C-alpha cells in the first residue's frame, strides 16, 4: 500500500539524513577539546557539539517534503522548538545500551552521564533522558522509521507561535501516513506491534525532555560566565 509518493518521501528523507549525519564523526576534532578532570569542564566541548548538531538539524529540515512551502517565520518557529528534541533523537544513533553511553568512534568522543553533568545539567534531565534513549533504542527502528520520526517531530502544528498551523498539519499528516503505512507494509511482526503508538509516545516523552532541558538551560545561561562559553548559534536558537 506504499504509494509512489510515499516511496518518494522515504527516499528523500533517507538521502537528507545521509547528507546531514556523518557516522565517522570526523568533524569532532574542530570542537573545543573535552576536559574531564565543581567547574563545568565539558561545557565548551558540548556547546560546540550541540551547535554543530543544530546546523545538521537545520540542513535535514530544509529537505523535508513541504517544509520550504512554509513561511520563513514558521520555519523558524518549528526549528527553534524542535532542535533540542531532534538532537536527542538523532543522538540515539550513537547511543549504546552496552554501557549507556554515546559512542562517537573514539574514547575522546564517547560520552556518558558524567560528561553532560560537567556541562551543568542534573539528574532531573539526565535520568529521563537515559530512559528515553533506552526505550527508543529498544524499538529497533528501521532507518526509514528513524528519519520519518525526526521529520514528524520538526513539522509539529502545535508548537507555540505557529501561524499557518493548518499547513503544518497538512505536511505532518503526509509524513504520519507515510510512517503508518511503512510500518504495515515493511516492518514484520512482532516488531511492528503497536509500533506507531510507541513512536508517538516518544514524541510525547520528548516534549517533557524539551521542557526540562529548557528550564536548566535558562538557569545555566543566565550566568554570564556560562553564556560566554556558548556559541552564537546556540544562543540564537536555544535562547539568550
Amino acid at each position: 500500500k506504499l504509494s509512489e509518493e510515499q516511496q518518494h518521501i522515504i527516499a528523500i528523507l533517507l538521502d537528507a539524513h545521509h547528507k546531514t549525519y556523518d557516522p565517522t564523526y570526523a568533524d569532532f576534532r574542530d570542537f573545543r577539546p573535552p576536559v574531564r578532570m565543581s567547574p563545568l569542564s565539558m561545557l565548551p566541548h558540548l556547546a560546540d557539539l550541540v551547535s554543530y548538531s543544530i546546523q545538521k538539524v537545520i540542513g535535514f529540515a530544509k529537505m523535508i517534503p513541504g517544509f520550504r512551502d512554509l513561511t520563513s517565520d514558521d520555519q523558524i518557529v518549528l526549528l527553534k522548538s524542535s532542535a533540542i528534541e531532534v538532537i536527542m533523537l538523532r543522538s540515539n544513533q550513537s547511543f549504546t545500551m552496552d554501557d549507556m553511553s554515546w559512542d562517537c568512534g573514539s574514547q575522546d568522543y564517547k560520552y556518558d552521564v558524567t560528561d553532560v553533568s560537567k556541562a551543568g545539567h542534573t539528574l532531573e534531565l539526565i535520568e529521563p533522558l537515559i530512559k528515553f534513549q533506552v526505550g527508543l533504542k529498544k524499538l529497533n527502528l528501521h532507518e526509514e522509521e528513524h528519519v520519518l520520526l525526526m521529520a514528524i517531530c520538526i513539522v509539529s502544528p502545535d508548537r507555540p507561535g505557529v501561524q499557518d498551523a493548518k499547513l503544518v498539519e497538512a505536511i505532518q499528516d503526509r509524513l504520519s501516513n507515510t510512517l503508518q503505512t511503512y510500518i504495515r507494509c515493511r516492518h514484520p511482526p512482532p516488531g511492528s506491534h503497536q509500533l506507531y503508538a510507541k513512536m508517538i509516545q516518544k514524541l510525547a516523552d520528548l516534549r517533557s525532555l524539551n521542557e526540562e532541558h529548557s528550564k536548566q538551560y535558562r538557569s545555566l545561561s543566565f550566568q554570564p560566565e556560562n553564556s560566554m562559553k556558548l556559541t552564537p548559534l546556540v544562543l540564537e536558537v536555544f535562547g539568550n
Binding site: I58, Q75, I76
Partner: peptide
C-alpha cells in the same frame, strides 16, 4: 528576537 543565523542557514 531576530534570527539572522537561523534565517541564513535556511537559505
Amino acid at each position: 528576537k531576530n534570527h539572522p543565523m537561523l534565517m541564513n542557514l535556511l537559505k
